[PDB]
């Protein structure tokens, strides 16, 4: 907690996520495995998410 009221909150997770693969070129296949996260219970009128740094440097 910074004096101005800014909070930093980090946690360590192991995430297992669905990566729907299309195995037509197997085993010469490339895939794009997604990782989608957002707010349960809060719509875009209440909670929005943004990347902390430039999007290309935020993961």
């Amino acid at each position: 907690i910074t004096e101005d009221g800014t909070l930093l909150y980090t946690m360590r997770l192991t995430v297992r996520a669905e990566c729907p693969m299309h195995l037509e070129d197997f085993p010469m296949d490339a895939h794009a495995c997604p990782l989608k996260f957002g707010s349960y219970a809060y719509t875009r009128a209440e909670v929005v998410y943004e990347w902390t740094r430039e999007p290309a440097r935020s993961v």
Epitope: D4, T6, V48, E50, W51, E54, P55, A56
Partner: antibody, heavy 117, light 106 residues
Framework: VQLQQSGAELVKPGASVKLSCTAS????????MYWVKQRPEQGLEWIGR????????KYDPKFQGKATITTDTFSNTAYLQLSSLTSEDTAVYYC???????????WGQGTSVTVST | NIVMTQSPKSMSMSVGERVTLSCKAS??????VSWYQQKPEQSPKLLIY???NRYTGVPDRFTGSGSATDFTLTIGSVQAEDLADYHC????????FGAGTKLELK
């Protein structure tokens, strides 16, 4: 919400300049700050940005060394300082803040830097 | 560096007709593409942020459309107060802007 830039400046070639941008309506700590130059009838060129929360700054490679950006949390101002400038950078300079989707939602009015003798 | 190519460089047109401005991205820039309007001797004004998100105060006739590397700004019922430079800028990486499109009345 309101960015107030310094006035226009005439500068001798080879000298130094210090442009200012006073933010009203928000804390500069809460966003990133951007300096953007624009030559007459030409595209926008990005100079660099600063994070007032930490002071971490990034510069366009062609402005590395030549430009430096600093902040002042107390006065809510961002400063662009041009160490050694030739006649080529006789362009307007814009102060902008980061917006919703990393867009630049609020720009300053622009400080006209003209250089001659 | 992500270079953004803006087409056409300049285009003249008449009032009240659909005009579309295209921007091309060198690399992937997901939807962090913005469209700015610059009237003469005025600072740029954000029109579209993200891909297809009108900024507050932008008339509903300004429509943004996007992709991974291809974006367009479409003006619908054009008016006479739309004569301005239009710049596209990416924000996926450190920001870069295109040359711009100088709208003309004809």
């Amino acid at each position: 919400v309101q960015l107030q830039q310094s006035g226009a400046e005439l500068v001798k070639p080879g000298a130094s300049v210090k442009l200012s941008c006073t933010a009203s309506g928000f804390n500069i700590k809460d966003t990133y700050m951007y300096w953007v130059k624009q030559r007459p009838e030409q595209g926008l060129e990005w100079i660099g940005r600063i994070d007032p929360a930490n002071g971490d700054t990034k510069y366009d490679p062609k402005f590395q060394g030549k430009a430096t950006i600093t902040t002042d949390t107390f006065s809510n101002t961002a400063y662009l300082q041009l160490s050694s400038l030739t006649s080529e950078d006789t362009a307007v300079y814009y102060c902008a803040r980061k917006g919703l989707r990393w867009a630049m939602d609020y720009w300053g009015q622009g400080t006209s830097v003209t250089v001659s003798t | 560096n992500i270079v953004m190519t803006q087409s056409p460089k300049s285009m003249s047109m008449s009032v009240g007709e659909r005009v579309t401005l295209s921007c091309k991205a060198s690399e992937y820039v997901g939807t962090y593409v913005s469209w700015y309007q610059q009237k003469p001797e005025q600072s740029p004004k954000l029109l579209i942020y993200g891909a297809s998100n009108r900024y507050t105060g932008v008339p509903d006739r300004f429509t943004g459309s996007g992709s991974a590397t291809d974006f367009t700004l479409t003006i619908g019922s054009v008016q006479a107060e739309d004569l301005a430079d239009y710049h596209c800028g990416q924000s996926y990486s450190y920001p870069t802007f295109g040359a711009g499109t100088k709208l003309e009345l004809k």
